[PDB]
Design a protein around this motif. Structure first.
Motif, mmCIF file in Angstrom:
data_model
loop_
_atom_site.group_PDB
_atom_site.id
_atom_site.type_symbol
_atom_site.label_atom_id
_atom_site.label_comp_id
_atom_site.label_asym_id
_atom_site.label_seq_id
_atom_site.Cartn_x
_atom_site.Cartn_y
_atom_site.Cartn_z
ATOM 1 N N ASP A 1 1.776 2.212 -5.402
ATOM 2 C CA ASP A 1 0.200 1.927 -5.988
ATOM 3 C C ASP A 1 0.424 0.869 -6.789
ATOM 4 O O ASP A 1 -0.601 0.185 -7.121
ATOM 5 C CB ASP A 1 -0.096 3.199 -6.855
ATOM 6 C CG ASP A 1 -0.969 4.036 -6.103
ATOM 7 O OD1 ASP A 1 -1.578 3.735 -4.947
ATOM 8 O OD2 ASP A 1 -1.162 5.209 -6.463
ATOM 9 N N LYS A 2 1.443 0.077 -7.262
ATOM 10 C CA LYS A 2 1.725 -0.887 -8.062
ATOM 11 C C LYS A 2 2.746 -1.925 -7.677
ATOM 12 O O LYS A 2 3.857 -1.245 -7.411
ATOM 13 C CB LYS A 2 1.630 -0.514 -9.372
ATOM 14 C CG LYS A 2 2.576 0.667 -9.975
ATOM 15 C CD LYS A 2 2.690 0.697 -11.422
ATOM 16 C CE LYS A 2 1.175 1.432 -12.072
ATOM 17 N NZ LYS A 2 1.485 1.809 -13.336
ATOM 18 N N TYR B 1 0.822 -1.137 0.039
ATOM 19 C CA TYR B 1 -0.068 0.049 0.004
ATOM 20 C C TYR B 1 1.090 1.221 -0.035
ATOM 21 O O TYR B 1 0.589 2.382 -0.050
ATOM 22 C CB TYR B 1 -1.156 0.130 1.085
ATOM 23 C CG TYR B 1 -2.319 -0.501 0.982
ATOM 24 C CD1 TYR B 1 -3.112 0.175 0.187
ATOM 25 C CD2 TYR B 1 -2.875 -1.697 1.749
ATOM 26 C CE1 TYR B 1 -4.452 -0.565 -0.115
ATOM 27 C CE2 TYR B 1 -3.978 -2.393 1.412
ATOM 28 C CZ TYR B 1 -4.836 -1.665 0.551
ATOM 29 O OH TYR B 1 -6.228 -2.335 0.320
#
Lengths: 312, 650, 260
Positions: free
Chosen positions: B487-488, B484
Motif C-alpha cells: 500500500d505504500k 499495488y
C-alpha cells in the motif's frame, strides 16, 4: 579614409573579394552573394524623358529546400546594413504602411511599418508565401510605381518610398522538384511574381567533396571567434566604399545597348520574360558599374550580368 | 545610548561595528558558512574612475561581529542606508588622511555615496508579502514586460520675482515644495508675487515598470502576478522588457516595491565530493536515465534525450553580431496511451520556467510606449516549453515556431510595431500520426501529416511506437502492479536511483560550471556520420548533441567515443540471418587462419582485437567475435582457458 | 492599537445542536434581506478571488514639534488626510506645525475580496446562480483557493470568521438488506427497462475511484469515462439529477486588470 578608398579603387581584384566578403559566414553560393551585393546599390532611376520616375531598384528573391543557409544572409543584412528592416512575413496594411488615428482631430497618420521604414535600403521579408492576399497586393501596389498610397477617412495620400525587397520563399511541399516550372512550385500569382529582378534557386544533394568541407566549416565555426570566417578585408572600409559608390551616378553607351538588344533576344529565346526583366538587368548593370567603380560602362562587365541571368 | 522611537538601532555603536567590519574582513564566509583585505581593495579601486555606487553583499551574516547589523537592516532599511551614507564618507576620509595624496578632498566633501544590498534570501513573491513585511527588504525573480518612459520629478525648483529678477532655489522634503510668497532681498523689498521656473531645475527621474513574477516554488492554484515596481535616478533605462531579472528593494504600501538594486547578470564541499565520486562511475549515463523517472519504463533514447535536453549544451556568442545556443527542439510521435503526457507534466515540474500550451508587442497608449504582454514561450526565454497535440494545431500559428526552431527570435510586423526580439528556449512537442497511430505500410514522412521543411529543421524526433508483443508488456503490467502489491512505496530506496534533490543540484552545477569545446579531433567521425544520412540542420543538431554528451560526466574536452552514441541515438530514434551466418563463417575462417599462421599461439583477446582490426578501416562487432569463439568452443576448435590467454585445439 | 492577536469565531455544528439552528447552511437566495447582522454559514463554489492587499485600520501621524503621535481610525473604503493638528499641546498654542505619516506604526490587515456563487442543485427551476461578496481579513486570507466548494461562516454587513471545505442508521439499513451492489445498481433509474450492466458501470463511474499520486511530480487519473454508442437522455438526466454538480451539455479583465 580617402587613403584607403583611393587604394581600394586602383586595384583589379576588388570585386572577387567583394563577392566572398559580403557574406563570410556562408559556404558556397556565389550567385546569391552577387545578387545581395548588387542589391544594396541601385541606379539610373532618375527621371524619364517625360516626367515620371521609374523603378530603379533591385528586387532579390531566394527559394529552395528547407534547412539551408539562405536565412543567414537575412540575419547578416539586418546586422550590417543601417537601412535595413526585417520582418518575419508570416506574422504580418502593416507591410504597406498602416493607418492609425489621433484623437485631437480624429485624424489619420500613416505608419511606415515594414514597407516604408527604409530609405535607399533593403526591406527583408522572411517567409513570403505564408502571407495573406491583402499585404501581397499592397506590396504589388507599392511596387508597380515607386510609391505607396493610403486611402483613409476621406483623405488620399501617396508618397515616395524606395526599397529593395529581399524575399525569402519556400515551396508548397518544401522540396524543390525539377519536374516543372517556377510558377506552379512557388504558388503565387503572376503579378506578384513579376517586378522581381533576380531569382535564386538552391537545390541540395549528397556531394561529399564539398559536403565534408561545409560540415568542417560548420564545426570550425563553433568556437570562440575563429579566423576561418574572416574575410580578406573588414566592413570598416566597405561601408564608406558602399557610400562612395552610391554617390557615383554612372551611364550606359552605344556598344552596351547594341549588346543589350541581342541579350534581351537571347533571354527571350529561352521562352515569363518582358520589359521588367530587361529593366532589372539594366539596373543591375549600373550597380555592377558602381561596385567596380567604372563610369562609362563597357559591355564586358555587362557580360558577367548576362552570365548571372543565364545562371539563374 | 541613543534610541530612535520604534527602532532598535543605535547610531554610534552600529557606526563603530560597521567600521570594524569594513576595516577587517578576509573571506570568513568561506571558512564558517589566499586573498587579503576584501573590502579595502574594492573601495580603493572604485575611487578613481568616479563610480559612486557600492555593491554590498549582505558576508555581514557570516561575520562574527555584525550579526546584530543584518538583523537590524531587514526591518529598517531607510534609516540604515541614510546612516551608511555618512559612515562610508567618514571611513573614506579616514582612508584619505592615512596616505599622501593630491587634491581629492575638494570633490569628496560634497559628494554622496550610497549602498546597494542584494545578497538576501529568496521569498515566495508577493503572496508571502503579508502586512508585517511592509518597509522591509524583498527580492523578486522574474521578467519585466513594460517600461514606462522616464518621468522627470523635481528635486529642486527655481523661483524668480518677475519684476526684479532675483532667483531662489528650493528643494524637496517628504513630498512638499514650499512656495515663497513675497520677495525678501534689499533691491526688491516690495511685496510681489514670485514665479516658478522649472526648465532650469534638476529633476529626479522616476519610472514605473511592469514585472511578471515567478518564484522558485509556486503554490497550487496560484496564477502569475504583475507587480508595478518603480525605479528612480541613476537606474533609469538600465532595466527594460525582455530579460530575466532578479530585483531587490523595499516593499511599500495599492502596494509597490522601491528598488535598491537590480541584477541584469546571473552547494557545499561534501556534496561536491559526492558529485565528483558519483561522476566517476561508468553506468552514470544510464543511471540518470533511470533516475529521471522511476515510475515509468525504460525509454532509453527518449529519456536520454530529455536528460541532455535539460542539460542544455553550450551557448557561445560573438562580440557584436553573432550568437549560437546549445539547444535541441524535440518531437514525439507514434502509438498513443503511453507515458507522453506524464513526461509533458514531469518536465513542467522540473524547470522553473515553462508553459503548458508566443507573446505580442503592444503600443500602450497611456504611457505612449511599446510594451510587451505575454506568457507561453515568451515567458520561458529560459528552460523548456511543452506543447501537446502538434498535428491538431493550426497553420497560422506554425509560422512563429518556424522562426523559433533554430533562429530563436520573434519578428512582429503589424499596426504600430515592426520589431524583432529575443525568444529562445526549447520546445518539447508531442504529436500523433493523424488518424493512423502509425502504419507500417506508409512512410514516416506521410504518416504524421507534418511538413518536411519544418521537420528537417527539427533537431530530434522520437518514434515512441509500441508494437505490442510478448515478454515485454507482461513486465509492463507487472511493474504497474508491483507498487499495488504494497500500500505504500517505502521500499523505493534500495535500488540504483539518485534522488531528485541531488540530481537538480548536480544538473545546476554542470550547467553553470562547464563550457566544453568541440575540438578538431572528432572531425573524422562526424563527416561520415553526416554522409550516412546524406546517402545542415542534422549537423547543427548533432554538434549540440555531442557537446551535451560532453556536458555530462564532468568533461571540458569532447571525446571521439561521445559522438558514436549520439549518432546511435539519432539512428535509433527514427529506427539469425543468412548474411549474419556468412559473417560469422568468414570471421571464423579468418580467425582460424590468423590464429594458426603464427608459431606463438599463446595470445589473448585484446591483442587479437588490436592485431586484426588496425590494418583496415572501422570496428566490427566484438560480440559477434565472442559468439564465433563460443561456436568454436562448442565445436572444440579453440579453448578459452581464462581471460589472459586464448589458445586453439591441439 | 496594542492588539498582538486577531479574534475570530466559529459556530456550533448540528451534532451539538441536536444534543441540546444558529448555524444552518444558507443559500444566497435564502438571504431575505433581514439577515444582515446574523452569523451565517454559506455553501458554494468560488469563482472570483483577489490578491492579498494591505488595508490600513488606523493611520499614525507623527510630529517633531510636540512629539505626541496621534492615531486616527478609518472605517470606510476611503479617507482624508488630517493635516490639521489635533494634539493636546497644539490646542493651547498659536503655532499649528506640520504632521507626517508613518507606514510602520500604522496597523494594517491582509484584506481580500471574494465572490461566492450559488450551488447548482440548490438554485430553483429556471433561475440562475447569482453571486455575493465576502470581505476577508487577517490569517484566513490564504484559506481560499479558487475552484472549490466552501462553507463560509461569518457576519453579514461578508466578514468571514471561519471557513471549511469538503446518518449511520441510514447507511447501516442500506447495508443490512443483503446484495448491496445489485440493490444499488437496480435502484437508480427504475423508469427504464433492464440494462443492469451499462448502468452498473455508471454506478462505478459516479463512485469515481482512487486518485494516485507518486509524490515525485506525476499524477495519473483516478477516473472513468464511459461511452454510450447506440441506435435510436433519461439515464443521462437521472445520473445528473442524482449526482451533485451535474451539468447537462480564460480571459483578461480590464476593470480590475486580472486573469478571470
Amino acid at each position: 579614409e580617402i587613403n584607403e578608398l583611393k587604394e581600394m579603387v586602383k586595384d583589379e581584384h576588388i570585386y572577387d573579394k567583394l563577392v566572398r566578403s559580403i557574406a563570410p559566414a556562408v559556404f558556397g553560393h556565389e550567385a546569391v552573394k552577387k545578387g545581395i551585393l548588387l542589391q544594396m546599390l541601385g541606379g539610373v532611376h532618375k527621371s524619364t524623358v517625360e516626367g515620371i520616375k521609374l523603378r530603379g531598384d533591385i528586387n532579390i528573391c531566394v527559394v529552395g529546400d528547407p534547412s539551408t543557409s539562405k536565412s543567414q544572409f537575412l540575419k547578416y543584412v539586418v546586422g550590417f546594413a543601417p537601412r535595413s528592416v526585417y520582418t518575419s512575413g508570416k506574422a504580418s496594411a502593416g507591410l504597406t504602411a498602416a493607418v492609425v488615428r489621433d484623437e485631437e482631430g480624429g485624424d489619420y497618420t500613416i505608419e511606415a511599418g515594414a514597407l516604408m521604414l527604409a530609405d535607399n535600403g533593403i526591406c527583408c521579408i522572411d517567409e513570403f508565401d505564408k502571407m495573406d492576399i491583402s499585404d501581397q497586393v499592397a506590396i504589388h501596389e507599392a511596387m508597380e510605381q515607386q510609391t505607396i498610397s493610403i486611402a483613409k477617412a476621406g483623405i488620399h495620400a501617396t508618397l515616395n518610398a524606395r526599397t529593395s525587397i529581399l524575399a525569402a520563399a519556400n515551396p508548397v511541399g518544401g522540396r524543390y522538384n525539377r519536374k516543372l516550372s517556377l510558377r506552379g512550385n512557388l504558388n503565387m500569382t503572376a503579378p506578384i511574381m513579376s517586378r522581381f529582378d533576380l531569382f535564386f534557386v538552391i537545390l541540395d544533394d549528397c556531394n561529399e567533396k564539398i559536403d565534408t568541407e561545409l560540415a568542417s566549416h560548420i564545426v570550425d565555426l563553433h568556437m570562440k571567434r575563429d579566423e576561418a570566417i574572416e574575410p580578406p578585408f573588414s566592413a570598416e572600409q566597405l561601408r564608406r566604399y558602399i557610400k562612395y559608390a552610391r554617390t557615383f551616378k554612372p551611364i550606359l553607351t552605344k556598344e552596351a545597348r547594341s549588346y543589350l538588344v541581342e541579350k534581351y533576344k537571347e533571354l527571350r529565346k529561352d521562352d515569363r520574360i518582358t520589359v521588367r526583366q530587361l529593366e532589372s538587368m539594366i539596373r543591375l548593370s549600373e550597380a555592377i558599374a558602381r561596385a567596380n567603380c567604372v563610369d562609362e560602362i563597357t559591355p564586358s562587365f555587362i557580360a558577367e550580368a548576362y552570365d548571372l541571368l543565364r545562371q539563374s | 545610548l541613543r534610541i530612535i522611537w520604534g527602532t532598535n538601532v543605535s547610531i554610534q555603536e552600529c557606526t563603530t561595528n560597521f567600521r570594524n567590519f569594513l576595516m577587517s574582513f578576509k573571506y570568513k564566509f568561506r571558512k564558517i558558512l589566499d586573498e587579503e583585505l576584501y573590502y579595502i581593495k574594492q573601495l580603493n579601486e572604485m575611487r578613481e574612475l568616479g563610480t559612486s555606487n557600492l555593491n554590498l553583499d549582505a558576508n555581514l551574516l557570516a561575520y562574527k561581529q555584525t550579526e546584530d547589523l543584518y538583523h537590524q537592516l531587514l526591518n529598517y532599511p531607510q534609516e540604515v542606508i541614510s546612516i551608511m551614507d555618512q559612515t562610508i564618507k567618514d571611513c573614506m576620509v579616514s582612508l584619505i588622511v592615512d596616505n599622501n595624496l593630491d587634491y581629492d578632498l575638494d570633490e569628496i566633501e560634497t559628494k554622496f555615496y550610497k549602498v546597494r544590498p542584494y545578497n538576501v534570501g529568496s521569498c515566495k513573491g508577493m503572496r508571502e508579502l503579508n502586512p508585517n513585511d511592509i518597509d522591509k527588504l524583498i527580492n523578486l525573480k522574474g521578467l519585466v514586460l513594460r517600461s514606462t518612459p522616464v518621468i522627470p520629478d523635481m528635486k529642486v525648483a527655481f523661483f524668480k520675482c518677475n519684476v526684479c529678477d532675483h532667483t531662489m532655489a528650493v528643494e524637496i522634503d517628504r513630498g512638499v515644495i514650499q512656495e515663497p510668497a513675497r520677495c525678501e532681498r534689499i533691491d526688491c523689498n516690495e511685496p510681489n508675487s514670485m514665479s516658478l521656473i522649472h526648465n532650469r531645475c534638476s529633476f529626479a527621474d522616476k519610472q514605473v515598470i511592469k514585472l511578471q513574477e515567478t518564484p522558485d516554488f509556486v503554490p497550487d492554484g496560484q496564477t502569475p502576478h504583475s507587480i508595478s515596481l518603480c525605479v528612480y535616478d541613476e537606474l533609469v533605462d538600465s532595466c527594460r522588457a525582455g530579460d530575466r531579472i532578479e530585483v531587490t528593494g523595499t516593499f511599500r504600501s495599492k502596494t509597490y516595491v522601491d528598488v535598491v538594486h537590480v541584477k541584469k547578470v546571473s552547494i557545499t564541499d561534501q556534496d561536491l565530493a559526492k558529485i565528483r565520486e558519483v561522476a566517476a562511475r561508468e553506468d552514470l549515463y544510464s543511471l540518470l536515465a533511470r533516475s529521471i523517472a522511476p515510475s515509468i519504463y525504460e525509454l532509453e533514447d527518449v529519456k536520454k534525450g530529455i536528460l541532455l535536453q535539460l542539460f542544455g549544451g553550450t551557448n557561445k556568442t560573438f562580440t557584436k553580431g553573432g550568437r549560437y545556443r546549445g539547444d535541441i527542439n524535440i518531437l514525439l510521435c507514434g502509438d498513443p496511451s503511453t507515458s507522453k503526457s506524464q513526461i509533458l507534466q514531469y518536465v513542467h515540474k522540473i524547470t522553473p520556467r515553462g508553459v503548458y500550451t508566443t507573446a505580442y508587442i503592444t503600443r500602450d497608449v497611456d504611457t505612449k510606449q511599446l510594451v510587451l504582454e505575454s506568457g507561453a514561450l515568451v515567458l520561458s526565454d529560459g528552460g523548456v516549453c511543452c506543447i501537446d497535440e502538434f498535428d491538431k494545431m493550426s497553420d497560422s500559428t506554425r509560422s512563429v515556431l518556424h522562426e523559433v526552431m533554430e533562429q530563436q527570435t520573434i519578428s512582429i510586423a503589424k499596426a504600430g510595431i515592426i520589431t524583432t526580439l529575443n525568444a529562445r528556449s526549447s520546445i518539447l512537442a508531442s504529436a500523433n500520426p493523424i488518424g493512423s497511430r502509425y502504419n507500417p505500410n506508409l512512410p514516416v514522412t506521410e504518416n504524421i501529416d507534418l511538413p518536411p521543411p519544418l521537420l528537417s529543421r527539427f533537431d530530434l524526433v522520437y518514434l515512441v511506437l509500441d508494437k505490442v508483443d510478448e515478454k515485454n508488456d507482461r513486465e509492463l503490467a507487472k511493474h504497474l502492479t508491483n507498487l499495488y502489491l504494497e500500500d505504500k512505496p517505502e521500499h523505493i530506496s534500495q535500488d540504483d536511483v539518485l534522488p531528485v534533490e541531488f540530481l537538480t543540484m548536480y544538473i545546476s552545477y554542470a550547467k553553470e560550471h562547464i563550457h566544453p569545446i568541440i575540438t578538431e579531433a572528432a572531425k573524422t567521425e562526424l563527416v561520415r556520420a553526416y554522409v550516412g544520412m546524406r546517402k545542415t540542420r542534422q549537423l547543427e543538431s548533432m554538434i549540440r548533441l555531442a557537446e551535451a554528451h560532453a556536458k555530462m560526466k564532468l568533461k571540458n574536452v569532447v571525446e571521439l567515443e561521445d559522438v558514436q552514441e549520439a549518432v546511435r541515438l539519432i539512428r535509433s530514434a527514427i529506427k539469425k540471418s543468412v548474411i549474419q551466418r556468412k559473417l560469422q563463417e568468414d570471421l571464423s575462417r579468418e580467425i582460424m587462419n590468423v590464429l594458426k599462421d603464427q608459431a606463438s599461439d599463446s595470445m589473448s583477446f585484446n591483442e587479437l582485437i588490436k592485431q586484426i582490426n588496425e590494418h583496415s578501416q572501422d570496428r566490427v562487432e566484438s560480440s559477434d567475435i565472442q559468439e564465433a569463439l563460443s561456436r568454436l568452443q562448442q565445436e572444440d576448435k579453440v579453448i578459452v582457458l581464462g581471460e589472459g590467454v586464448r589458445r586453439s585445439v591441439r | 492599537l496594542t492588539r498582538r492577536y486577531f479574534l475570530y469565531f466559529k459556530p456550533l455544528s448540528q451534532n451539538c445542536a441536536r444534543r441540546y439552528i444558529s448555524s444552518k447552511p444558507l443559500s444566497v437566495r435564502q438571504i431575505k434581506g433581514d439577515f444582515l447582522g446574523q452569523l451565517i454559514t454559506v455553501r458554494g463554489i468560488i469563482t472570483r478571488v483577489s490578491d492579498v492587499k494591505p488595508a490600513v485600520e488606523v493611520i499614525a501621524y507623527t510630529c517633531d514639534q510636540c512629539g505626541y503621535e496621534v492615531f486616527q481610525e478609518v472605517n470606510s473604503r476611503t479617507f482624508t488626510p488630517l493635516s490639521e493638528c489635533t494634539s493636546e499641546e497644539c490646542s493651547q498654542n498659536q503655532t499649528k506645525g506640520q504632521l507626517f505619516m508613518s507606514t510602520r506604526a500604522s496597523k494594517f490587515s491582509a484584506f481580500q475580496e471574494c465572490k461566492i456563487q450559488e450551488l447548482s442543485q440548490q438554485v430553483p427551476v429556471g433561475h440562475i446562480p447569482r453571486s455575493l461578496n465576502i470581505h476577508v481579513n487577517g490569517t484566513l486570507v490564504r484559506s481560499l483557493s479558487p475552484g472549490d466548494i466552501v462553507d463560509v461562516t461569518g457576519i453579514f454587513l461578508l466578514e468571514a470568521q471561519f471557513v471549511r471545505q469538503h446518518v449511520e442508521e441510514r447507511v447501516m439499513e442500506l447495508i443490512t438488506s443483503g446484495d448491496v451492489y445489485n440493490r444499488l445498481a437496480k435502484s437508480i433509474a427504475p423508469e427504464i427497462y433492464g440494462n443492469l450492466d451499462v448502468k452498473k458501470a455508471l454506478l462505478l463511474l459516479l463512485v469515481g475511484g482512487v486518485d494516485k499520486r507518486v509524490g515525485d511530480g506525476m499524477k495519473i487519473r483516478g477516473d472513468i469515462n464511459v461511452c454510450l454508442m447506440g441506435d435510436p437522455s433519461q439515464l443521462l438526466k437521472a445520473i445528473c439529477k442524482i449526482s451533485p454538480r451535474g451539468v447537462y451539455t480564460v480571459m483578461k479583465d480590464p476593470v480590475t486588470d486580472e486573469m478571470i
